[PDB]
Amino acid sequence: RVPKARNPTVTYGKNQVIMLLYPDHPTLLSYRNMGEEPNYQEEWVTHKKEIRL
């Protein structure tokens, strides 16, 4: 059994997603476009952070 992270606090903007994250421990965040070029990216977040995808 492995845990599930807390739901982030999402907020939208023009062609953007603003995500506020509350990790309790090193958590992996990855994202990819769903088109021809996925442009995969990832990072471990270890504290509270805000991302702009």
Partner 1 sequence: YEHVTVIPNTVGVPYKTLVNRPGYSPMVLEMELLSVTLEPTLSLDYITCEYKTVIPSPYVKCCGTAECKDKSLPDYSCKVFTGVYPFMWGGAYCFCDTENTQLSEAHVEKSESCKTEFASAYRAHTASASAKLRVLYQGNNVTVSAYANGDHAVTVKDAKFIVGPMSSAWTPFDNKIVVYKGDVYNMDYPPFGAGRPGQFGDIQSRTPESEDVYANTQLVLQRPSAGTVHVPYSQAPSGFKYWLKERGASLQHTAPFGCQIATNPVRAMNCAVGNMPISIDIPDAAFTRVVDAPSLTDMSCEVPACTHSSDFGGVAIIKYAASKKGKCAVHSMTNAVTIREAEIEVEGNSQLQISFSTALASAEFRVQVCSTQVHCAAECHPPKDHIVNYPASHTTLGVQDISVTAMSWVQKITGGVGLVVAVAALILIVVLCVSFSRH
Q: Can residue 1 be called a binding residue for partner 1 (CB under 8 A)?
A: no
Q: Considering CB under 8 A, how many residues would be counted as binding partner 1?
A: 15
Which is nearer to partner 1, 3 or 13 (by Cβ)? 13
Q: How far apart (Å, rounded) are the C-alpha atoms in residues 16 and 22? A: 20
Q: How far apart (Å, rounded) are the C-alpha atoms in residues 46 and 21? A: 10
- Which one-letter amino acid corresponds to residue 29? L
Within 2-41, the residues that bind partner 1 by CB under 8 A are: 12-17, 30, 32, 34-38, 40
Q: According to DSSP H, which parts of 1-53 are helical? A: none
CB of 42 to partner 1, least distance (A): 6
